[PDB]
Write a protein that binds this ligand. Structure first.
Ligand SMILES: Nc1nc2c(ncn2[C@@H]2O[C@H](COP(=O)(O)OP(=O)(O)O)[C@@H](O)[C@H]2O)c(=O)[nH]1
Ligand SMILES: [Mg+2]
Lengths: 142, 165
Protein backbone atom coordinates (compact mmCIF):
# COMPACT_ATOMS: atom_id res chain seq x y z
CA UNK A 1 0.00 0.00 0.00
CA UNK A 2 1.03 3.63 -0.49
CA UNK A 3 0.96 4.16 3.27
CA UNK A 4 3.30 1.23 3.94
CA UNK A 5 5.55 2.43 1.12
CA UNK A 6 5.78 5.91 2.63
CA UNK A 7 6.63 4.58 6.09
CA UNK A 8 9.47 2.53 4.57
CA UNK A 9 10.84 5.73 3.05
CA UNK A 10 10.66 7.37 6.49
CA UNK A 11 12.50 4.54 8.23
CA UNK A 12 15.09 4.22 5.46
CA UNK A 13 15.85 7.94 5.53
CA UNK A 14 16.35 8.27 9.28
CA UNK A 15 19.73 8.10 10.97
CA UNK A 16 21.06 8.71 14.48
CA UNK A 17 24.49 10.21 13.76
CA UNK A 18 25.78 10.51 17.32
CA UNK A 19 24.99 10.73 21.01
CA UNK A 20 27.08 12.17 23.83
CA UNK A 21 27.22 12.73 27.56
CA UNK A 22 28.49 15.98 29.07
CA UNK A 23 29.22 17.18 32.56
CA UNK A 24 26.63 19.97 32.63
CA UNK A 25 28.57 22.00 35.19
CA UNK A 26 31.57 22.37 32.88
CA UNK A 27 29.99 21.63 29.52
CA UNK A 28 32.73 19.10 28.86
CA UNK A 29 31.88 15.99 26.87
CA UNK A 30 32.53 12.85 28.92
CA UNK A 31 31.71 10.51 26.04
CA UNK A 32 30.39 10.75 22.48
CA UNK A 33 29.48 7.74 20.36
CA UNK A 34 29.25 8.20 16.60
CA UNK A 35 29.68 5.51 13.93
CA UNK A 36 26.58 3.44 13.18
CA UNK A 37 24.65 3.68 16.45
CA UNK A 38 21.67 1.93 14.88
CA UNK A 39 23.47 -0.72 12.81
CA UNK A 40 22.47 -4.42 13.18
CA UNK A 41 24.52 -7.23 14.68
CA UNK A 42 26.16 -4.89 17.14
CA UNK A 43 25.55 -4.45 20.85
CA UNK A 44 26.26 -0.72 20.98
CA UNK A 45 28.21 0.15 24.11
CA UNK A 46 29.83 3.14 25.79
CA UNK A 47 32.95 3.41 27.94
CA UNK A 48 32.32 6.53 30.01
CA UNK A 49 34.45 7.81 32.93
CA UNK A 50 32.88 6.57 36.17
CA UNK A 51 33.25 10.06 37.63
CA UNK A 52 30.02 10.79 35.75
CA UNK A 53 28.35 8.93 38.61
CA UNK A 54 29.41 11.85 40.80
CA UNK A 55 28.00 14.56 38.53
CA UNK A 56 24.93 16.29 39.94
CA UNK A 57 24.18 17.50 36.42
CA UNK A 58 24.63 15.57 33.18
CA UNK A 59 23.54 16.63 29.72
CA UNK A 60 22.85 14.11 26.96
CA UNK A 61 22.81 15.18 23.32
CA UNK A 62 21.56 13.43 20.17
CA UNK A 63 22.07 14.35 16.52
CA UNK A 64 19.82 12.78 13.88
CA UNK A 65 19.05 13.12 10.19
CA UNK A 66 15.88 12.59 8.18
CA UNK A 67 15.64 12.62 4.39
CA UNK A 68 11.87 12.52 4.75
CA UNK A 69 9.57 15.12 6.25
CA UNK A 70 7.69 14.03 9.38
CA UNK A 71 4.72 15.68 11.10
CA UNK A 72 4.45 14.20 14.60
CA UNK A 73 8.00 13.18 15.47
CA UNK A 74 8.97 12.38 19.04
CA UNK A 75 11.46 10.44 21.11
CA UNK A 76 11.22 8.20 24.16
CA UNK A 77 14.40 7.63 26.10
CA UNK A 78 14.62 5.32 29.07
CA UNK A 79 17.71 4.35 31.04
CA UNK A 80 17.49 1.05 32.91
CA UNK A 81 19.48 -0.83 35.50
CA UNK A 82 18.37 -4.35 34.65
CA UNK A 83 14.62 -3.98 35.05
CA UNK A 84 14.40 -0.86 37.21
CA UNK A 85 14.01 2.63 35.79
CA UNK A 86 16.77 5.14 36.41
CA UNK A 87 15.53 7.76 33.94
CA UNK A 88 12.84 8.36 31.35
CA UNK A 89 12.60 11.29 28.99
CA UNK A 90 10.02 12.18 26.42
CA UNK A 91 10.01 14.94 23.85
CA UNK A 92 7.63 15.99 21.11
CA UNK A 93 9.51 17.53 18.16
CA UNK A 94 6.50 17.56 15.87
CA UNK A 95 7.61 18.74 12.44
CA UNK A 96 10.92 17.53 11.01
CA UNK A 97 12.27 19.22 7.90
CA UNK A 98 13.04 17.06 4.84
CA UNK A 99 16.76 16.38 4.38
CA UNK A 100 17.52 17.92 7.75
CA UNK A 101 20.07 17.20 10.47
CA UNK A 102 18.85 18.00 13.98
CA UNK A 103 20.06 18.01 17.57
CA UNK A 104 18.28 17.53 20.88
CA UNK A 105 19.77 17.89 24.33
CA UNK A 106 18.44 17.47 27.86
CA UNK A 107 20.09 18.50 31.15
CA UNK A 108 19.71 15.45 33.42
CA UNK A 109 19.70 16.05 37.19
CA UNK A 110 24.93 2.15 43.42
CA UNK A 111 28.72 1.39 43.13
CA UNK A 112 30.06 1.10 39.59
CA UNK A 113 30.83 -2.59 39.42
CA UNK A 114 27.13 -3.30 39.85
CA UNK A 115 26.11 -0.67 37.28
CA UNK A 116 28.79 -1.11 34.62
CA UNK A 117 27.63 -3.46 31.89
CA UNK A 118 24.11 -3.46 33.36
CA UNK A 119 23.00 0.02 32.30
CA UNK A 120 21.11 0.47 29.05
CA UNK A 121 20.02 3.70 27.36
CA UNK A 122 17.12 2.91 25.06
CA UNK A 123 16.02 5.60 22.65
CA UNK A 124 12.93 5.14 20.53
CA UNK A 125 11.88 7.54 17.80
CA UNK A 126 8.27 7.71 16.58
CA UNK A 127 6.27 9.61 13.99
CA UNK A 128 2.93 9.56 15.79
CA UNK A 129 2.78 5.79 16.31
CA UNK A 130 5.15 4.57 13.61
CA UNK A 131 8.36 3.26 15.16
CA UNK A 132 11.04 4.98 13.08
CA UNK A 133 14.08 3.75 14.96
CA UNK A 134 15.28 2.06 18.13
CA UNK A 135 18.65 2.49 19.83
CA UNK A 136 20.24 0.63 22.72
CA UNK A 137 23.56 1.57 24.28
CA UNK A 138 24.97 -0.48 27.15
CA UNK A 139 27.05 1.59 29.55
CA UNK A 140 30.41 0.68 31.03
CA UNK A 141 31.92 3.10 33.52
CA UNK A 142 35.64 3.49 32.78
CA UNK B 1 4.99 24.62 33.42
CA UNK B 2 7.88 24.41 30.97
CA UNK B 3 8.50 27.48 28.83
CA UNK B 4 9.03 27.21 25.09
CA UNK B 5 11.45 29.72 23.59
CA UNK B 6 11.78 29.95 19.82
CA UNK B 7 15.06 31.44 18.55
CA UNK B 8 14.99 32.61 14.95
CA UNK B 9 16.84 35.09 12.81
CA UNK B 10 18.68 35.18 9.51
CA UNK B 11 21.40 32.62 8.92
CA UNK B 12 24.76 33.73 10.39
CA UNK B 13 23.07 35.92 13.03
CA UNK B 14 24.68 33.76 15.71
CA UNK B 15 21.71 31.81 17.04
CA UNK B 16 23.60 28.56 17.62
CA UNK B 17 26.62 30.22 19.19
CA UNK B 18 24.35 32.09 21.62
CA UNK B 19 22.70 28.82 22.66
CA UNK B 20 25.93 26.89 23.18
CA UNK B 21 27.65 29.85 24.83
CA UNK B 22 24.66 30.20 27.15
CA UNK B 23 24.96 26.55 28.20
CA UNK B 24 28.71 26.77 28.83
CA UNK B 25 29.60 24.66 25.81
CA UNK B 26 32.40 25.20 23.28
CA UNK B 27 31.52 27.51 20.38
CA UNK B 28 34.52 27.06 18.08
CA UNK B 29 33.23 24.09 16.11
CA UNK B 30 29.83 25.52 15.22
CA UNK B 31 28.50 24.90 11.72
CA UNK B 32 25.29 25.95 9.93
CA UNK B 33 22.11 24.45 11.36
CA UNK B 34 20.27 22.44 8.70
CA UNK B 35 17.18 21.77 10.77
CA UNK B 36 16.71 22.54 14.44
CA UNK B 37 18.83 22.49 17.61
CA UNK B 38 16.80 22.05 20.80
CA UNK B 39 18.08 22.42 24.35
CA UNK B 40 15.94 21.45 27.32
CA UNK B 41 17.34 22.93 30.53
CA UNK B 42 16.53 24.72 33.77
CA UNK B 43 17.45 28.31 34.56
CA UNK B 44 16.39 30.18 37.67
CA UNK B 45 13.85 27.49 38.50
CA UNK B 46 12.29 27.64 35.03
CA UNK B 47 12.34 24.55 32.82
CA UNK B 48 13.04 25.74 29.29
CA UNK B 49 12.75 24.19 25.84
CA UNK B 50 14.82 26.39 23.54
CA UNK B 51 14.39 25.89 19.82
CA UNK B 52 17.19 27.25 17.63
CA UNK B 53 15.87 26.78 14.10
CA UNK B 54 18.07 27.24 11.02
CA UNK B 55 17.72 30.59 9.30
CA UNK B 56 18.99 29.83 5.78
CA UNK B 57 16.53 31.07 3.15
CA UNK B 58 15.46 27.52 2.30
CA UNK B 59 14.60 26.77 5.94
CA UNK B 60 12.54 29.84 6.85
CA UNK B 61 9.48 28.49 5.11
CA UNK B 62 9.38 25.82 7.84
CA UNK B 63 9.64 28.24 10.76
CA UNK B 64 5.84 28.40 11.02
CA UNK B 65 5.68 24.68 11.86
CA UNK B 66 7.21 25.53 15.22
CA UNK B 67 5.07 28.54 16.21
CA UNK B 68 2.48 26.64 18.22
CA UNK B 69 2.69 27.21 21.97
CA UNK B 70 5.68 29.54 21.81
CA UNK B 71 5.96 31.58 25.01
CA UNK B 72 8.93 33.64 23.97
CA UNK B 73 10.48 34.60 20.66
CA UNK B 74 14.20 35.38 20.55
CA UNK B 75 15.13 37.32 17.40
CA UNK B 76 18.88 37.30 16.78
CA UNK B 77 20.47 39.95 14.60
CA UNK B 78 24.01 40.26 13.30
CA UNK B 79 24.67 43.85 14.41
CA UNK B 80 27.53 44.14 11.93
CA UNK B 81 25.59 42.97 8.86
CA UNK B 82 24.00 46.27 7.86
CA UNK B 83 23.35 44.77 4.42
CA UNK B 84 20.63 42.28 5.34
CA UNK B 85 19.25 44.60 7.99
CA UNK B 86 16.31 45.35 5.69
CA UNK B 87 15.51 41.67 5.07
CA UNK B 88 15.93 41.13 8.81
CA UNK B 89 13.30 43.83 9.41
CA UNK B 90 10.83 42.29 6.99
CA UNK B 91 11.22 38.78 8.41
CA UNK B 92 10.66 40.05 11.95
CA UNK B 93 7.60 42.18 11.22
CA UNK B 94 6.21 39.20 9.31
CA UNK B 95 6.59 37.11 12.47
CA UNK B 96 4.97 39.75 14.67
CA UNK B 97 1.69 39.56 12.78
CA UNK B 98 1.48 35.75 12.98
CA UNK B 99 -1.60 34.54 14.87
CA UNK B 100 0.10 31.55 16.46
CA UNK B 101 2.73 33.88 17.95
CA UNK B 102 0.35 36.49 19.41
CA UNK B 103 1.18 37.50 22.99
CA UNK B 104 4.62 35.88 22.85
CA UNK B 105 7.31 37.97 24.53
CA UNK B 106 9.95 39.34 22.16
CA UNK B 107 13.64 39.52 22.95
CA UNK B 108 15.83 41.08 20.28
CA UNK B 109 19.48 40.09 20.57
CA UNK B 110 21.62 42.62 18.68
CA UNK B 111 24.48 40.12 18.52
CA UNK B 112 28.15 40.44 17.52
CA UNK B 113 28.57 43.71 19.42
CA UNK B 114 32.23 42.70 19.71
CA UNK B 115 32.62 43.51 16.01
CA UNK B 116 33.95 46.91 14.79
CA UNK B 117 31.07 48.02 12.56
CA UNK B 118 28.37 46.87 14.98
CA UNK B 119 25.39 49.22 14.83
CA UNK B 120 24.12 50.55 18.16
CA UNK B 121 20.98 49.23 19.81
CA UNK B 122 19.25 52.51 19.00
CA UNK B 123 20.16 52.08 15.33
CA UNK B 124 18.84 48.53 15.24
CA UNK B 125 15.78 49.63 17.19
CA UNK B 126 15.11 52.07 14.36
CA UNK B 127 16.10 49.84 11.44
CA UNK B 128 13.75 47.10 12.66
CA UNK B 129 10.86 49.47 13.51
CA UNK B 130 10.55 48.08 17.04
CA UNK B 131 8.80 51.23 18.29
CA UNK B 132 5.77 50.38 16.14
CA UNK B 133 5.54 46.94 17.78
CA UNK B 134 2.65 46.98 20.16
CA UNK B 135 1.15 43.47 20.03
CA UNK B 136 4.15 42.11 21.92
CA UNK B 137 6.23 43.07 24.95
CA UNK B 138 9.75 43.52 23.65
CA UNK B 139 13.28 44.47 24.63
CA UNK B 140 16.45 44.89 22.62
CA UNK B 141 19.64 43.60 24.21
CA UNK B 142 23.05 44.16 22.67
CA UNK B 143 25.36 41.18 23.18
CA UNK B 144 28.31 39.08 22.02
CA UNK B 145 27.78 35.35 21.64
CA UNK B 146 31.53 34.68 21.34
CA UNK B 147 32.48 36.33 24.65
CA UNK B 148 29.09 35.63 26.22
CA UNK B 149 28.69 39.26 27.25
CA UNK B 150 25.14 40.31 28.15
CA UNK B 151 23.45 37.06 27.14
CA UNK B 152 21.98 36.52 30.62
CA UNK B 153 20.55 40.06 30.98
CA UNK B 154 18.50 39.39 27.86
CA UNK B 155 17.35 35.89 28.78
CA UNK B 156 16.58 36.85 32.38
CA UNK B 157 14.35 39.73 31.32
CA UNK B 158 12.54 37.45 28.87
CA UNK B 159 11.73 34.89 31.56
CA UNK B 160 10.49 37.52 34.00
CA UNK B 161 8.16 39.02 31.39
CA UNK B 162 6.76 35.67 30.27
CA UNK B 163 6.11 34.52 33.84
CA UNK B 164 4.08 37.67 34.52
CA UNK B 165 1.47 36.39 32.05
N1 LIG C 1 32.73 38.12 16.45
C1 LIG C 1 31.60 37.44 16.68
N2 LIG C 1 31.22 36.31 15.93
C2 LIG C 1 29.97 35.52 16.15
C3 LIG C 1 29.13 35.87 17.14
N3 LIG C 1 28.02 34.94 17.13
C4 LIG C 1 28.26 34.08 16.13
N4 LIG C 1 29.46 34.37 15.47
C5 LIG C 1 30.10 33.70 14.32
O1 LIG C 1 29.18 33.82 13.22
C6 LIG C 1 29.13 32.63 12.48
C7 LIG C 1 27.64 32.10 12.47
O2 LIG C 1 27.22 31.83 13.80
P1 LIG C 1 26.11 30.84 14.09
O3 LIG C 1 25.88 30.72 15.59
O4 LIG C 1 26.38 29.43 13.60
O5 LIG C 1 24.95 31.42 13.38
P2 LIG C 1 23.45 30.98 13.19
O6 LIG C 1 23.46 30.87 11.66
O7 LIG C 1 22.55 32.20 13.37
O8 LIG C 1 23.17 29.72 13.91
C8 LIG C 1 30.12 31.63 13.14
O9 LIG C 1 31.31 31.81 12.34
C9 LIG C 1 30.27 32.19 14.55
O10 LIG C 1 31.49 31.87 15.24
C10 LIG C 1 29.55 37.10 17.96
O11 LIG C 1 28.86 37.52 18.88
N5 LIG C 1 30.71 37.80 17.71
MG1 LIG D 1 22.69 27.62 13.62
Amino acid sequence: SAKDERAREILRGFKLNWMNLRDAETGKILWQGTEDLSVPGVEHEARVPKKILKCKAVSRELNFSSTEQMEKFRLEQKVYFKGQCLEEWFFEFGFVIPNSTNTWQSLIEMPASVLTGNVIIETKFFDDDLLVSTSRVRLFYV
Amino acid sequence: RELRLLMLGLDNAGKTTILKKFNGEDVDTISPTLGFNIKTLEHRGFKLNIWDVGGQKSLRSYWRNYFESTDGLIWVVDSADRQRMQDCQRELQSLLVEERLAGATLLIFANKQDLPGALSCNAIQEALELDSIRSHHWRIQGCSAVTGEDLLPGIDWLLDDISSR
